């Protein structure tokens, strides 16, 4: 919607058939490229950082052998599935140096990206028995912890996904089954990132990962950051209305007319009809989050009363632009006598002005000109009936 509204061809007819609402609001919530080439061959590792990578290789053998005793993956004549033979347990020194390159940075590349690609280093420390398990499962799982897991897994999957992307480009296309999106990954990916914390924590109980970055909620505004939209869309209505203010003032350029006053009218008019109970009701009483929702829509309605001035000007042939939207708007019409007081200002301002024209010309009517009375008639008289129907019911 915003992409059609902010750019693309002026004529609405060339996408009016494509254009449709195709959405409704839920109750409260339902939640060209150019990567930077960074040199890797030229950088020389420090001596201090080399101790970690050297010790990891020795951890690969001895600790893994104890697990294989549980699985009983003993030596054998050759690799075979019937006995699950696995005889290649040996140090890496027997292999060639070029073979060690693929095993050089399998995980250290991601940590290098944690320091190199991501410009962050933890200031843990400068250069130089059986605790009980605390109760962590008692508290309900928080959404911010989902932000930690999702952001870090996004970084790991971004680096690994681009790595397999260069593998696909290197091998020259071909069959491409492994391409999947990020959030909608398979059940194994959804379970493995959660389940692999338990296995490695006993080995990695020392030091412990300590990073914290995230905050979110699910309420009004855009969404209280990353959640239900609803309230969020009204911001664009107010902004795009302000774009039309200069056109109506100046005429009393053509792109804004067709997009706002010829493309968005059925969208908003459908919104008031299908979601009438959303607007008129309250959060507590429903026939849902209509405390501040009722305010700015009334600002829009009062502004519509200002837009339909007593002077005719280019009245315009677009009847849905003028009268039908006003009727359903009055249908989609808790107290202010509370919140911003622009509703009282509106309720007196255009009401008194639009009326006081009529009490000026009840003796004149047509006898005094005979165009502002008709414009005032269809502006006010059918719309106000629906207004008092909403109030009186």
Would you kindly provide a written description of the structure presented here, covering whatever features stand out?
This protein is mostly helical and 393 residues long. Helix 8 crosses helix 9 (254-263), helix 10 runs parallel beside helix 13 and helix 13 (319-331) runs parallel beside helix 15 (372-392). Helix content is 53%, strand content 0%. The protein has helices spanning 2-6, 13-16, 47-71, 97-102, 108-115, 143-171, 187-203, 231-251, 254-263, 265-274, 276-280, 293-307, 319-331, 342-361, 372-392. The chain starts with a helix and ends with a helix. It is elongated and about 110 Å long. It is built from 15 helices and no strands.
Largest sheet: none
Shape: elongated
Task: State the share of residues found in helices, binned by percent.
Answer: 40-55%
Query: Terminal Cα separation, in Å?
Result: 35 Å
- Beta content comes to under 5%
Structural class: mainly alpha
Number of strands: 0
Specify Rg, calculated over alpha carbons: 33 Å
What is the element string, with H for helices and E for strands?
A: HHHHHHHHHHHHHHH
What is the helix tally?
Answer: 15
PDB class: membrane protein
Keywords: Ryanodine receptor, RyR, calcium channel, mutation, NTDC mutation, malignant hyperthermia, central core disease, membrane protein
Entry title: Rabbit RyR1 disease mutant Y523S in complex with FKBP12.6 embedded in lipidic nanodisc in the open state
Name: Ryanodine receptor 1
């Amino acid at each position: 919607g915003v992409t059609s509204e902010e750019e693309l061809h002026l004529t609405r007819k060339l996408f009016w058939g494509i254009f449709d609402s195709l959405a409704h609001k839920k109750y409260d919530q339902e939640l060209n490229f150019d990567p930077r080439p960074v040199e890797t061959l030229n950088v020389i590792i420090p001596e201090k950082l080399d101790s970690f990578i050297n010790k990891f290789a020795e951890y690969t053998h001895e600790k893994w052998a104890f697990d294989k005793i549980q699985n009983n993956w003993s030596y054998g004549e050759n690799v075979d599935e019937e006995l699950k033979t696995h005889p290649m347990l040996r140090p890496y020194k027997t292999f060639s140096e070029k073979d060690k390159e693929i095993y050089r940075w399998p995980i250290k590349e991601s940590l290098k990206a944690m320091i190199a690609w991501e410009w962050t280093i933890e200031k843990a420390r400068e250069g130089e028995y059986n605790p009980q398990p605390p109760d962590l499962s008692g508290v309900t799982l928080s959404r911010e912890l989902q932000a930690m897991a999702e952001q870090l897994a996004e970084n790991y999957h971004n680096t690994w996904g681009r790595k397999k992307k260069q593998e696909l480009e290197a091998k020259g296309g071909g069959t491409h089954p492994l391409l999947v999106p990020y959030d909608t990954l398979t059940a194994k990916e959804k379970a493995r990132d959660r389940e692999k914390a338990q296995e490695l924590l006993k080995f990695l109980q020392m030091n412990g990962y300590a990073v914290t970055r995230g905050l979110k909620d699910m309420e009004l505004d855009t969404s209280s950051i990353e959640k239900r939209f609803a309230f969020g869309f009204l911001q664009q209505l107010l902004r795009w209305m302000d774009i039309s203010q200069e056109f109506i003032a100046h005429l009393e350029h053509e792109q804004e007319i067709k997009f706002f006053a010829k493309i968005l009218l059925p969208l908003i008019n459908q919104y008031f009809t299908n979601h009438c109970l959303y607007f008129l009701s309250t959060p507590a009483k429903v026939l849902h989050a209509s405390n501040k929702e009722k305010e700015m829509i009334t600002s829009l309605f009062c502004k519509l009363a200002a837009l339909v001035r007593h002077r005719v000007s280019l009245f315009g042939t677009d009847a849905p632009a003028v009268v039908n939207c006003l009727h359903i708007l009055a249908r989609s019409l808790r107290t202010v006598m509370s919140g911003p007081e622009i509703v009282k200002a509106g309720l007196r301002s255009f009401f008194e002005s639009a009326s006081e024209d009529i009490e000026k010309m009840v003796e004149n009517l047509r006898l005094g000109v005979g165009q502002n009375l008709t414009y005032t008639t269809v502006a006010l008289l059918p719309v106000l009936t629906t207004l008092f129907q909403h109030i009186a019911q």
